[PDB]
Amino acid sequence: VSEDLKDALSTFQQTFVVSDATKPDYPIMYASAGFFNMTGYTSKEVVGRNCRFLQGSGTDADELAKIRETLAAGNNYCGRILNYKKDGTSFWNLLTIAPIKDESGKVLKFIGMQVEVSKHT
Amino acid sequence: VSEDLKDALSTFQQTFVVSDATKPDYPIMYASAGFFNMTGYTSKEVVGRNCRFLQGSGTDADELAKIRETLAAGNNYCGRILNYKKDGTSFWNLLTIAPIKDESGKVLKFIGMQVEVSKHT
Numbered sequence: 001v002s003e004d005l006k007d008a009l010s011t012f013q014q015t016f017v018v019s020d021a022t023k024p025d026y027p028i029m030y031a032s033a034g035f036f037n038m039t040g041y042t043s044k045e046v047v048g049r050n051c052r053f054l055q056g057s058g059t060d061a062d063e064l065a066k067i068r069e070t071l072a073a074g075n076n077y078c079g080r081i082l083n084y085k086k087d088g089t090s091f092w093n094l095l096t097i098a099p100i101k102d103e104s105g106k107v108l109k110f111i112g113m114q115v116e117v118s119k120h121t
Numbered sequence: 122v123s124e125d126l127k128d129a130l131s132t133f134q135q136t137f138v139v140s141d142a143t144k145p146d147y148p149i150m151y152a153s154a155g156f157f158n159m160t161g162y163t164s165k166e167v168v169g170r171n172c173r174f175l176q177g178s179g180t181d182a183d184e185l186a187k188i189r190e191t192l193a194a195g196n197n198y199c200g201r202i203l204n205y206k207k208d209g210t211s212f213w214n215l216l217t218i219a220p221i222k223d224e225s226g227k228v229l230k231f232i233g234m235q236v237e238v239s240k241h242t
């Protein structure tokens with residue numbers, strides 16, 4: 001809440017997840033070290049869930065539409081979206097999603113790199 | 122993130138490079154084994170080089186402007202760009218660039234994940 005506090009104890013955390021692209025819920029298969037440090041959810045407990053548990057009231061619906069469109073097309077997504085820690089504390093997520101394709105081009109997984117950043121840049 | 126990330130991408134035989142954001146022309150520090158297969162260039166040909174050697178006259182200059190802006194801003198970049206293998210073969214490269222930052226929020230590296238993609242030109 002306090003302005004001076006947030007900046008002095010700036011946490012520029014970074015994590016990634018890998019999700020299964022062959023199931024309609026795009027479930028996390030693996031969440032990297034740092035996921036709990038950033039979000040307050042353990043890397044173990046998020047396995048089998050869709051990453052939308054990080055979203056809340058202020059998350060931009062149009063950005064979510066572009067993500068779904070990316071996953072369906074099998075391409076990539078780059079955005080800065082509003083996410084929420086287990087706490088309910090909001091943070092800005094510099095989110096980069098890329099397809100993990102096999103030898104013949106099949107999209108088997110997606111990787112999502114998540115970077116906590118401030119509101120603008 | 123970074124070493125764990127490299128390992129996850131390698132586990133799925135992905136093509137990616139890691140570039141130095143502290144050296145001035147973003148030289149490649151690391152090129153995965155998939156890079157040779159995708160481009161015809163070995164890692165040793167390529168380590169120490171800016172990845173612009175993949176470009177040619179068909180490459181969209183407007184996209185390259187978007188990339189320059191991303192790297193100066195420490196943000197991410199998602200696009201599909203026309204690139205050329207060592208033998209001149211032209212292809213779509215779905216390129217995804219994300220920052221790797223330290224404690225400061227200082228960008229140390231960029232990772233660029235590359236996949237050769239068919240055509241919805």
Ligand SMILES: Cc1cc2nc3c(=O)[nH]c(=O)nc-3n(C[C@H](O)[C@H](O)[C@H](O)COP(=O)(O)O)c2cc1C
Pocket residue numbers: 017018019026050051052054055064065067068071081083093095097110111112113114
């Ligand atoms: C690999 C991967 C990583 C993702 N990471 C996040 C994330 O960090 N924050 C978030 O809000 N959504 C993230 N998503 C997006 C959601 O999981 C979901 O795809 C999005 O909400 C759109 O689908 P929906 O409209 O059904 O919710 C990620 C998706 C994928 C597949």
Ligand SMILES: Cc1cc2nc3c(=O)[nH]c(=O)nc-3n(C[C@H](O)[C@H](O)[C@H](O)COP(=O)(O)O)c2cc1C
Pocket residue numbers: 138139140147171172173175176185186188189192202204214216218231232233234235
């Ligand atoms: C990690 C990373 C990966 C990159 N991968 C590619 C690539 O696969 N193909 C390409 O044309 N450019 C790639 N680039 C972009 C070019 O290296 C260069 O940044 C771009 O051409 C803009 O700079 P310039 O206008 O000086 O050429 C990559 C850049 C970074 C930092």
